[PDB]
From a paper:
We next solved the crystal structure of ATP-bound mcGAScat without dsDNA via soaking. Here, one ATP was clearly bound at its designated binding pocket (Site-1), but the second NTP binding site (Site-2) remained empty (i.e., the GTP binding site). Strikingly, electron densities were missing for both the ribose of ATP and Mg2+; the catalytic residues stayed in the inactive state and the triphosphate appeared suboptimal for coordinating Mg2+. The ribose was modeled without density for presentation.
Upon directly binding to and dimerizing on dsDNA, [name] cyclizes ATP and GTP into 2′−5′/3′−5′-linked [name], a unique metazoan second messenger for initiating type-I interferon (IFN-I)-mediated inflammatory responses. [name] is central to antitumor immunity, host defense against an array of pathogens, and regulating autoimmunity. Here, we resolve these numerous fundamental mechanistic questions in innate immunology and present a unifying catalytic mechanism of [name]. Finally, we reveal how mouse [name] achieves more stringent substrate selectivity and higher catalytic efficiency than the human enzyme.
Author numbering: 144 to 240, 246 to 506
Amino acid sequence: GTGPDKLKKVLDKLRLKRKDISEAAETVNKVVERLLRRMQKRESEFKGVEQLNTGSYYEHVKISAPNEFDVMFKLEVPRIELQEYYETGAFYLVKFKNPLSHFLEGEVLSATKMLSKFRKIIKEEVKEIKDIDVSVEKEKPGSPAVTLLIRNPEEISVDIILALESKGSWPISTKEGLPIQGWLGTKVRTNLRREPFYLVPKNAKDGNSFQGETWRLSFSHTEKYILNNHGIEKTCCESSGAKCCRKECLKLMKYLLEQLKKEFQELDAFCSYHVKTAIFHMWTQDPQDSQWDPRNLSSCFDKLLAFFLECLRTEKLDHYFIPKFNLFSQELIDRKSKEFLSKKIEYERNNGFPIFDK
Ligand SMILES: Nc1ncnc2c1ncn2[C@@H]1O[C@H](COP(=O)(O)OP(=O)(O)OP(=O)(O)O)[C@@H](O)[C@H]1O
Ligand SMILES: [Zn+2]
């Protein structure tokens, strides 16, 4: 009945959704493993592909849509030379200091050519999977994912994202990113930044020339590590430690946005990565595990909402790893969309969150 009890009931509702998601993920993993084995046996530019087990499912914060999954296939590419396309770090061109020589447009790696060959090979090899009902969805223009359609008998879509892996040092645009020093610490930050980084094809949608061939940085591996190692204490949420409500707040906020986006197409510009980025900042601002005690679920959720509303008001939400990349810039999301979302969030906040019941 009370506000705090109603919020705990929403988490119970999300917990019940996880059984169907876990069962679908088992079917997805069977297909994905089968396909990866085929691509690893075939001789091609992609023989080295491996699954990167990242994203919301592997972070344990996939809260809905058991019929939709994303998987990332990483491919190590030695001797990558990056060129900033946007000097904020939002987009890069890939050049080389070559196994990928067939995909070059001049000196620039063509995502279009590379993805075309990736898709062609996936389609050939998926046709050889005989004991699962799986096909490749017809290509959609503007969608770089290669989408598998699995029938189990119900349809599950799996977006396969090709990611390049670079073992070089992280780009200079990330120099002041990952501001975890007061929370996870400087040794953790040093260790995380020695890991590879990833490049994911994404069209910049602007004054062209090399529109089509741009890539965005991806730190999905780092983000998974943070989600699963999120406490100032090493034992946070372990069997010999204390539970916190950090992930619960993320799930509630993701669900709030999902429910709002379902009702209002004015909110198309917003996505769950905005919520994830916001909570990364909130975990940096409030680093103590005691600031995320389970008994403070309601007040922690409310401070996350307040922080998100302030990001909307100031049209500023910096990418956690790329500080000059403003996800809420006027250029990327118009002012009226932010004011619309601010109005909806404030309504939910002051009226007991009726949209959770939808
Ligand atoms: N709009 C986006 N902008 C930047 N990165 C994004 C965006 N959407 C997804 N990502 C990338 O994907 C990861 C976060 O997405 P996630 O794994 O939660 O998938 P999802 O399909 O959005 O999840 P969910 O179904 O839980 O909402 C990060 O590695 C992030 O870099
Ligand atoms: Zn915890």
